Symmetry: C4
Subunit: 388 residues, 4 copies
């Protein structure tokens, strides 16, 4: 109909309720489920769906061997009905590639897939299910993007890309698209020293992205975008409650404009909702591996370098595997506020579980509740032994 405008603020997050869970690995042990990774969730005005990068093979299939690898010609961005697993028969291919993002502007959806060899990748921007624009690699070193939904305001959908080194300064760009066309792009500015895999959400005409500094920071970089002025700023979450993985133990004081040191060249896609006292941070429980997952209410985390948790909710036990996590919201829901949501990728297989030769995942997702709900843990649920 008309382009969606981020006119609402976030609902008060007093807890998280279960939203969707596909049990993909459990089910796929005996059905035609595609191997995936890098999943996310994204809504259209009339439906919300699961998304992920397929590996072009079923989990039980012999070609599942080797799926620990991130980039190949057999990957594609696929979407499928909420809480169903990604099967060969119900998965819709959005585009071909090994890195992606996607978002609905209120009229139709834009999907972006990057493919290519490491030194010669290219992004193709699809709009209304047709290819419209292409962008060639600018630094010839793994052109890559969000791996979770983008956000639009009045037809303008900003997207963060990075090209170049993963362990030194790289060239990050913010593209402002409208109907799949490039209105403008800027180089990253601000104090964030390295950006990768941004998780974004929008509220009150502003888009907030919590990304990952693979190079040096264990605290997360944040990019705040003005989609009208088509400008942005960047900094790090000030809070001592560190949210990357791996990471050092939490200090008593964090860093607002520099990476918090202790762990180099590694990390995991993650997210946060930065809204004053209504601030919630997601993170793996383990400081060493992609294990467990918890949400922590850390009032003013973005700007307070001594902020610590006032409430929390465990999502996945530390004795269970987690993975990437990102933000999304149903911008077309009823009500006066946007309900914050997120997903956690529950990785199974390699490298942690090497008795099998594949790597895949399932998805669990929650949204906020203004109630103070009881908590449960949500593991993948599959028994690896069954796959042997």
């Amino acid at each position: 109909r008309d382009f969606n405008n981020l006119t609402k603020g976030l609902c008060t997050i007093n807890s998280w309720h279960i939203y969707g869970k596909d049990n993909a690995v459990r089910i796929g042990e005996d059905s035609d489920v595609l191997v995936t990774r890098e999943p996310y969730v994204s809504c259209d005005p009339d439906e919300c769906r699961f998304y992920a990068l397929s590996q072009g093979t079923t989990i039980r299939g012999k070609h599942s061997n080797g799926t620990i690898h991130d980039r190949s010609q057999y990957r594609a961005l696929i979407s499928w009905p909420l809480s169903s697993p990604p099967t060969v028969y119900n998965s819709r291919v959005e585009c071909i590639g090994w890195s992606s993002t996607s978002c609905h502007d209120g009229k139709t959806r834009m999907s972006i897939c990057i493919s290519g060899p490491n030194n010669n990748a290219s992004a193709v921007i699809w709009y209304n299910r047709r290819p419209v624009t292409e962008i060639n690699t600018w630094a010839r070193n793994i052109l890559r993007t969000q791996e979770s939904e983008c956000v639009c305001h009045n037809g303008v959908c900003p997207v963060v890309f990075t090209d170049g080194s993963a362990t030194g300064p790289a060239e990050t760009r913010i593209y402002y698209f409208k109907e799949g066309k490039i209105l403008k792009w800027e180089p990253l500015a601000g104090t964030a020293k390295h950006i990768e895999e941004c998780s974004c959400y929008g509220e009150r005409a502003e888009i907030t992205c919590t990304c990952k500094d693979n190079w040096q920071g264990s605290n997360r970089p944040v990019i705040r975008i003005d989609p009208v002025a088509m400008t942005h700023t960047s900094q790090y979450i000030c809070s001592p409650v560190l949210t990357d993985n791996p990471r050092p133990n939490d200090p008593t004081v964090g860093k607002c404009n520099d990476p918090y040191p202790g762990n180099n060249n590694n990390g995991v896609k993650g997210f946060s909702y930065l809204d004053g006292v209504n601030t919630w941070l997601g993170r793996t429980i383990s400081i060493a591996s992609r294990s467990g997952y918890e949400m922590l209410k850390v009032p003013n985390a973005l700007t307070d370098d001594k902020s610590k948790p006032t409430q929390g909710q465990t999502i996945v036990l530390n004795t269970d595997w987690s993975g990437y996590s990102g933000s999304f919201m149903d911008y077309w829901a009823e009500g006066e506020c946007y309900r914050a949501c997120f997903y956690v990728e529950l990785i199974r297989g390699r490298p942690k579980e090497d008795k099998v030769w594949w790597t895949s995942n399932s998805i669990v997702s929650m949204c906020s509740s203004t109630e103070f709900l009881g908590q449960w843990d949500w593991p993948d649920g599959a028994k690896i032994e069954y796959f042997l």
Copy 2:
């Protein structure tokens, strides 16, 4: 379009005709059928569908081992086309959880799923396929609901929940929802001493629920709801034709306001159509187990403590496994009256058939006929030996 109003009375039930049957267990022996239990049927203005709580695994899958358990993080309310089996590829997830209800108000559908550990469960009410309201456990002991469809009148959809003990007094509440929002809730009143798993239907602006007294009664408690005044009453079916399972043998006189004694802390979800002389009761044939199923016309069963059968129809032979049973009607059918319908869950596997490690079921459903139709029996039809 407009909210549906319960303006019609029930059609005269002179017999029951076959409505739907999915043969899920037979088919699933060699196809991707999800393991389920707690099924039901519910109609939208343009389609009627089968519903059930998936176990997050196929029957042939290795994760089917252990599905005798009722609550886990791998369950979800799913719906699928009438008479098809619940397959991985055609099952639509309504919400995540281990206890549910769902009903269409004429404009859109409300689905409710409860999830959580036993001492910290919560219900999330979905409307128009979006989460709208959440209710935290009030007694910290297995918050649970109907396991069959709710009913709406002018947008108001009452739902019966129970939280607390299964073998002593508990806290049952009647919630009046409208567009997924809580208009009001009441504690249970009347003479019913314990309520669980209500089976409801509506006619002439009144909603009748036949539930189960797990604690003491072998006769069934009944809750009659006024969805306009948003008030209710409760009693037991007066009839000596006892309809819970297990149960003692039928006496010559029943109880109207107390549980009929003889069997404690056990029972099965069931239903009835209480409409004066047009009254029909469903029940297992066996007084000891979930075996067989029959419909008995017991005129004035609700109010006559000496009422006995005047007609009957066998649905499932006593040599075949049955299970839960509940009511539903197509409130959007043509004609001058609502045609009473019901389903019977045909449980296969554990605990009765323990040579297999799973527990699942298929569904059979009938609706009333004003004709006096010949009868057939409708078993699940699967051979357990094939699964060995």
Copy 3:
């Protein structure tokens, strides 16, 4: 929109072109294809689909053992997209039962399924996918119907049913339905001595049904129905070109009002297009078994007791298995005439191929061409050995 009216006459049939073929048995050797029999084809204003009676199991499934049996509680009328096979995942259940018919009146579809034990069967008439009317057995001996599509004119859809003996006089009735309701029914009249499994088509406000005399005739009985007056007549195809199976060899003169003798208590569902010189008869090539299939142009076959073929087309070689055959037309196609169509059931398995324990079939269907097209043969195509 509006009820369809049989305003056109048949197109001139100069040959038959391939219309649809599902290769169900070939495909089902390694995919989730339901076991079926008694198939047919029927069109809606916007789509034409394959129909059949499922056996409630896949062909590869262990429950396929015993599917030679015609009636069980596990059968149902299913429909699926033209030329696709009947799979667990794409088959839509129309109703439950072991004998059926179905037809679209231009506004919506009426489907009829009969279920029950032999002495207590009942038909339930569905309209707009809802049960509307039920008819109890009148002779307590296998109430049964067409097994191919019915035909409507101005909302009136006549259907032929038979109840009683298969080897002596029975009680055949013609029901005139409108919106699933019974407007009227008549007992069979005319000279046809026994009627079963009528194959019908409509043209110029008249409905012609070629049925089967299981009792005595090797020539086929024909019922011509006036859907406006709601009256009918019956006789036999006069032609010496005999079209039942089994049957004696063709004589030089046939019978117009008596069964042509030579074979008792057996037969096969079949069809014909009786339109003066534009008359075409279908039949198995073998006089002993359901083997092969051919179309023969026999001018004035219905009324000329010495009529013999003037043209022909082989459909299935005598070295290949055939089975039931029936008529249907797309009453919603463009043009000035109705194009005659038919299907042939290609039965595989028992009793002819007893190395397997199942019985199923695939479907081949053709429509007429005004051209004189070259001919091909169309076998099922599966290798039974693969199933061993």
Copy 4:
């Protein structure tokens, strides 16, 4: 809505971006994927889909044995969602046969399938999913057509057919269809000596077809059609950059009106975009087998007998199997020009890989970009050893 008119010219092709890839063989190793060959892509105003000739069996199925054969009664033209594989459950049958073409005229789609024995084949033209016209073989020797999409202009959709010898002069006809009806047909004229499997596209009210001279030419014949005047011309691509397979090595000067000699009675379906300096030719890398695939910018290839490449892009490495290739465009995309697209059939199995008994393929497809994008190679990706 209204018939589409070829009002735009081609976009400038500066490189090719990835459009779709189904990874059919990889996926089908462990899922219900139909065996196919002769694939293509074709768009409707609201969706673009993959098309191919099914073999009526899954790849893992036992009936896959022998699928190297081109014509049988078990083949059919099927279409399925872009980039999904052709599965038993998502494949839509357009018509039955072993040679086909299909195209949308802006209002609805026309599909053509030819079936029959070699000496008695016939084409049936479907429009709006109904059979409308039939054409009998005129030379009694494998009536055959494009194997890729046709193109329409103001409702007129020309199609090229060939009947007769594959190794001597044959009878090629150009049919001009409108709503499935024949408006006119012409015999082939011009200097092309033999025509088979034309790949066509339209721009500025002209339709260009790059075909294959199976008899003598290693350079490709080209047919340019005027869909308004319903007339055409034919010649060969003048360029010395030879594009059939097998073929001799490239000379320094080609032939404009005669086949370039060196290889007789063999070839492969291929295509080209002939647009002055914006000319791009596709071809296998190997001159001996269907191995590899590359796009070469050869300015004025059609008319310049000394034209050589000025740019290029490798699509499939010479160490990977290719096959047929053809053209298609989304005539309903936004913008001022038509974006040239093509697909490459990646054949697996026999005859090159004879350790398996089947022959199938997957599909890769690209569209042009005005950018100068980096290149990747796109192989089928399956490991034959897994199928052993």
